[PDB]
Symmetry: D2
Subunit: 498 residues, 4 copies
Amino acid sequence: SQLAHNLTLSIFDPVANYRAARIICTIGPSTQSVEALKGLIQSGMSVARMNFSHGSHEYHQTTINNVRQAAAELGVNIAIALDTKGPEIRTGQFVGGDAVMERGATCYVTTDPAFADKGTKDKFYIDYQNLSKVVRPGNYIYIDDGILILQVQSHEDEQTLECTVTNSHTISDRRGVNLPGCDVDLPAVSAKDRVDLQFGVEQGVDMIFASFIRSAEQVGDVRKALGPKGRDIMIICKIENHQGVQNIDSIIEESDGIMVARGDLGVEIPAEKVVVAQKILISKCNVAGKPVICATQMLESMTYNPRPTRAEVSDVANAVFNGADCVMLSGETAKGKYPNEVVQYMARICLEAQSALNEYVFFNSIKKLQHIPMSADEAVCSSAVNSVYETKAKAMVVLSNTGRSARLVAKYRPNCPIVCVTTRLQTCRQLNITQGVESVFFDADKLGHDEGKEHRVAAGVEFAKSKGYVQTGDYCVVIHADHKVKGYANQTRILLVE
Amino acid sequence: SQLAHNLTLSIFDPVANYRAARIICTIGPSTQSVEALKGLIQSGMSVARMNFSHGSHEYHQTTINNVRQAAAELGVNIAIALDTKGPEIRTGQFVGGDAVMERGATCYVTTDPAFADKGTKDKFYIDYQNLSKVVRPGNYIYIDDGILILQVQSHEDEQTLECTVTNSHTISDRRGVNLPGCDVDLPAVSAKDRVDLQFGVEQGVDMIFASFIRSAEQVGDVRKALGPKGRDIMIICKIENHQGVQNIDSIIEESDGIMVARGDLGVEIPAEKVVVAQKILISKCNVAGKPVICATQMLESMTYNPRPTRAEVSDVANAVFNGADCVMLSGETAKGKYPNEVVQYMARICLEAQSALNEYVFFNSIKKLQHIPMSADEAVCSSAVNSVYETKAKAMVVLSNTGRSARLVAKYRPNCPIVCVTTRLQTCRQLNITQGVESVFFDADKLGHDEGKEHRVAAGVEFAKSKGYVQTGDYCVVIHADHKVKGYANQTRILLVE
Amino acid sequence: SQLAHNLTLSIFDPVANYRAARIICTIGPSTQSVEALKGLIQSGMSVARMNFSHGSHEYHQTTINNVRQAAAELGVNIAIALDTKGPEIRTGQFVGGDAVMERGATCYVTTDPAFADKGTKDKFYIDYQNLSKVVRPGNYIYIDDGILILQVQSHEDEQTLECTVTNSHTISDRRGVNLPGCDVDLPAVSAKDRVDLQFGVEQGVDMIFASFIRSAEQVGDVRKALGPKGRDIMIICKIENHQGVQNIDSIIEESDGIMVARGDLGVEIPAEKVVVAQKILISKCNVAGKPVICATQMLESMTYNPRPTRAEVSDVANAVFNGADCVMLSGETAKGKYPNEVVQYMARICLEAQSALNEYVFFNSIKKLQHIPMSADEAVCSSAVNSVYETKAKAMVVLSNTGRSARLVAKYRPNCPIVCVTTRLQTCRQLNITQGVESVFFDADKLGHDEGKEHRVAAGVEFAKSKGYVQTGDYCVVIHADHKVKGYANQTRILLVE
Amino acid sequence: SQLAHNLTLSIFDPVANYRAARIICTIGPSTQSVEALKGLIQSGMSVARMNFSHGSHEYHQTTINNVRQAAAELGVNIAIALDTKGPEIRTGQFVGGDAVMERGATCYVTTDPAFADKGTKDKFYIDYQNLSKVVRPGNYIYIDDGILILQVQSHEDEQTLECTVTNSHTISDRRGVNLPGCDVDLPAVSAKDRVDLQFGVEQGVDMIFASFIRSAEQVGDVRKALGPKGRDIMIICKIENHQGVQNIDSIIEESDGIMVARGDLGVEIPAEKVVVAQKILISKCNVAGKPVICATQMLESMTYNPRPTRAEVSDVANAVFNGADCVMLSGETAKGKYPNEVVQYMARICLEAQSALNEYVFFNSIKKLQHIPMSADEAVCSSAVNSVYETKAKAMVVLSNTGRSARLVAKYRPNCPIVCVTTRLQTCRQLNITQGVESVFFDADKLGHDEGKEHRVAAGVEFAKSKGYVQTGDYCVVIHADHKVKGYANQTRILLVE
Ligand SMILES: O=P(O)(O)OC[C@H]1O[C@@](CO)(OP(=O)(O)O)[C@@H](O)[C@@H]1O
Ligand SMILES: O=P(O)(O)OC[C@H]1O[C@@](CO)(OP(=O)(O)O)[C@@H](O)[C@@H]1O
């Protein structure tokens, strides 16, 4: 039981020689410079995130170049993620630049575009043309981070809503709005996103963090916008609203992974619910074998302070316990004072939680949840991990070119490092969101196709020796195909290391 | 499994009609006024904490009077806790008021009292006379919140340590020091504490939060200082250092409960370890049936902001999941901007986590950990809870005068409110640190001794009806003695409510 | 696991001071005499069975009188069971007294009553008028213990079946027939049974072992034949054919208990299946809380020999492991050479298996299978047993007048004797089929109604002292109502014995 | 739970396409002829047992030749087992050929050899020279199958015991004696056995069923008598007395397997205990991975009747449920009326029990009991079976030359047939005592050493196709070494069948 086990823990237990969980950093003004990026990598960053809500192609290009240059200098592979601006609902302008909303007052919100540059406290524009169809009397309309809460009373006309102001707040031009009891039906991809997705393909980004995913159909639309050139880019779906949570199984099916986008989700859904949503979404991703990310306000105070709050530390740790592949940094690295320190703190917490983690229970729990039968490669991976626990093997080596084999193994939560040997560099980057995995690139061109698998295997083992995971006399559990089979791994071997 | 179960959760699940967890508030300048206190109670405060590190008997008296007056006005019983200053290690004074410590420099720390008003960056006084005996070469000496880290190189003489300065920092007069690899042997109770403990007895406080508990022997010394007059005051032991963690079983034995004092513990022990310590200590308290409190930096940002960080919310929730009876507020209520809001937020998070909580697994887990044989009353309580789950009983009533019976029941984590009927008002207050329990006072003097137990039972049931926990046709599971037995409860009944 | 546990067993483990399982003996020519019956009781008989297939009211009356006289002399209460003849299918007479059936031959079986005294190997009568409607081409018709197997080829006419003889066998007048792939639709109760049931009511028998129960409807018909005068007589349903097995849940619902009637079942169903049927039926009875009996050929060789076969000993033991309340003796006591010895052997085996029995796993297993909620009295019994395990209580006392409370407790398999205090003598007899229970009669008339329950309780405890189950300082777990509640027991107490 | 599961069973469930359990037949006058043996094999015999207590080398040779000739004709491999006479304790002769022992009488038992041909009811010879040293006053001495029970009163002298006769019985010349509370210290191997063991080596028998094994030291003595020429012959140790049961772990260590020799054990140990001993011994063998046999009186009545008793059928079934590799036939095939039928009945019961068997629980239960870590090949086998359950693989193929690999796999109880491909014919025979395994011989000489393993693998798969275990599209889980490793199998593959 989790209880009994808590009882076996000690604060003085030594931590592991490897950190399974992966850290994602958003790149902003604090972290754009190659020197800053180098600091981040050394501090522990595996994925760099660009938020297309901010900046421009020009700004983001600089980031891409800088990431590649910094990584190259440090001899490492870093995933690059494009985080779309996505569809937004905004108010228009107010006369005098500003508008003073008092509690108890009546105001009128309209989608009549005549009003975009002449709102007043009395009547102003919200730019979502379907506002009236989506909202009903009683529904709430949040403006300015959810700070100003208007309540919908009636349809003055087909484009205008009569509202009550429920609390006082001055609002300036063009605030964002939310609609918590409302199924928002903006397209999956805005016009800027479209230009945003193409750019991502062009500059060869590894993954897309797709904002605001309402549906399985929307993911497909994203896949389709990426096109043929974009087929191997991973689409990670951010769950930030009600519809996304509701549609999670279908979204998970379509996607390559999930982000638990807590900041938006937190407004959209009452905040106390975000915890249940985190546990559910992470678990469903774990069971499915797809990467899952916990995001937002994880170490927020460290945007300005050298040290985190107790609640924050607890939060990074619980996300790992929850089963997340990744934790994420937003403002703390984009605009913060202590970018290197925040990352270093997060890594340290992740390592500590990892000691407490019962990797074994996790393996068995996951294993019971799989449909039987399933697939030959899946059985190979699961049983191979079981072999790891049975022999106390100190490392694992897998051959994956797509990266599929590696996710399938990592999914089973072995208690040792997993070493993936890949013939694709992008695969090395893409695997930066999978917990517990390290990649070794094997250049097929220079070194040949390695059909008998002996070379790739030697390289993974050597890498394991090099990082100190194994010494002679240790077991290493190895996964690939035999000589005949193609397209998956049908074999496991336990080899002694010399 | 915890996994499978996460899968059954929903964000839209309705929360409970009762909140099990209890909130503790520290009373400072923001919250001293009767009006402020009334706001706190309404917001959800069950225990008011006075920190004797700050203020004076005079200041704290005002708090006591104000708490009682506010509670009286609201018709409620609020526990009063005395939080001792405890033994402190401080530096002396520096010449010019200040002293500029540079990285790489050598300085001398002495316990020679000749130096208390004439330290300099070169040599200054630390007021802990045993410093030299407790520290060895290689050990670290933290000054100013742990900001300035000196390392011990050698014993210049029997009272003076030659130190290296490991990082730059200007330090002013009389900073606190810590000794993380060091067994500090200050007495359990300072001279001020002694005057502090007596005052607490005199003003009739409910509990002591005893700072810095190193040992079982120390608790006894506290018990002894309280004296005969003080025998029914609960001693809650704060675990804030290494020795306290190491000695936890024996401390738990001696104590009436534990506090996981994260702020001090966090310096003393590396911070990433505080998480393991939290899980262990809470669990050991749950298994033992004694109240456990999670403290410090739980909603820290709310000292200054209307809304919490994501890490903070996650932290309050995980503490409940961890199994804590209580969560605590420190600065957020002592000196904060939004005292009512912070408490309201904490209560709301606690209620939400409670939905996710698997009360049933918790009951069984706890039950397996008890040694056999145990005790007739313990079996009665455990099996009575089992009855609650078996019938789906919506309330529970227990008779306790000492409060013992009530803790014993609450310990088994029923999924319904527990209603305790007590003949002692102090018991009603003392039970404010036990999760899931509500007290009804029955005035033996006015209403008689009630030996057949029918009256006390009627009152608990009526209270349950009144708060809406039960309606006619519901089961209420009831615990007390039969007609012969005295000193414990040997009986359980399932009664139908009319 | 059952495995690990087998590992903790030893042949030299001392057996218990009590035998939980109950033994049933069929009374025949060997055992009718009062002296023989006295030997049987001393040897271990708790229930005496009269088989109404044999004997007459006159013969069986002698048995009843003798049982009562023997029991009275020995100061004990013995249940009396009436085992009905039930509906039978028989052939008619053959010419010359006999008829020689050869393998490969054609013969004709008819229900034309003209043929009842003039069958021949060529054509003879079977007295079940529905034979033709119930059988189809391909079905088998067993005659003479299943020794002669005819196969049905066709309907010669509406009353006559053309058969193949599948194996050679000479058959004499009036052999029994079976129909293994056939739903036999004889009435539940024959005309003789009807006279048989009334007689049982008149002579005040404790239970009916109702032969050949096909259906829930049939049990009701039995209940109805017993009438109002017969309402408190238990109907134990013997499962001896296909339909009975198929309809077991509904039959179990209607019944007061089950017999696994292996001898008939063994012909009807292939023999290798009887094992699966035994395990299922016993388990379903255990889960339901109703008494279950394992019957037939249990110690068969002991009909003629002083000592049993290995297979036999294993069989009595496995029935206990299976979870049976009772084991039964048929021919071994009805017509056998060593009636006392066979019973003594069975008792000894039962005691030995009981040591190996994991009473605790059995308690938990049963407990998990109950639907929540269930009932206040059921929770009281289950949790009270849990109390027994938690304290290591050496005895249990329950108050039951109907005997209901006692079955409910025994159902939970405590590891100590259960002592039932009853105000009905019939209850003491009826409880002779419930494992692990001993009855003390309390004469309400002589000693009063005992509403405060103190007297009945003292008597059960004294009885426990007397048989040596408890000594001073031992715990005894006690079950009854409190002062208000009537109709069930809502209370448990753990009392110390003096 | 076993309970819940019983609930999922049905009598109409179809049985498997394979029978896991193996049947052993003792060859006597009824079964010696090649035609009889052919009938036995077809009926289901996998092992033929020769009992060297009866017959002579000459008689047994005929059996060996006949077995080989019958097997050869049927194209099958049948194991040959030599069942030793072993050490015996016998009385001497009585005057007049006979001696009439009355209850209550005093008689004298002596080891003075002067008395071997002149015993009388007054004084006679028992031929075990250590009788006096091994027995004490109070001990029992059984003569004639345990029929005549003498009790030891005193040592008349150093070679003679004064006895009471406890029950009447006429005894003739040279009856066997037992000593149930006595540690008998006959040598492991008699002089005839020695000639018996050598003969077995010479005629190339597969295994020895070693009678009466008291100790681990004794097994070694057997191993040593077999010699170098005899090194690959399996020693199966029969547990027939107290000492053997007591010393079971050490005996199991030394042995290649166990027989639960119920007929002797049943006298030696009280019969009701044989059940506990059966469960323990079988389980310990299962956990250890060594073959275990259940023996004696399993279908005894079928020595004379066409059909078994209910107790008998239950007995064969429970032995399978117990976890036995093998069931055995003794008299039923040696001297019986219906040798083919008895075997056919046993096979049928075994198949039926197999349906009820929870192979999966058995796999997991066994797996938990293994020490971790263990061995690379052991993990390969266990995890490979886990693969079978995960994919629903319908067959398994293993390469074993010693037969070791095959036992290791079978040990884990897969729910599908296991097909072993071996280069040794003796291995094919020896594997006839391992449940759930079928052997295919691959002639290394004719077909080469097959180092890449492709041929042996093709043959096992083809055999599986041929018996219908697999069709195209099915998974077959395959076990052997990779190209480098020698002496064990380090590899598992899941292959699709075409
Ligand atoms: O790229 P994924 O899809 O993970 O497939 C990798 C697996 O396929 C194989 C077999 O085709 O690749 P490879 O041909 O490169 O050797 C296995 O060796 C390898 O483990
Ligand atoms: O105060 P604690 O120690 O909890 O004891 C309370 C129990 O004792 C009893 C019995 O003595 O008190 P009471 O006399 O007040 O009725 C029980 O009724 C009650 O449940």
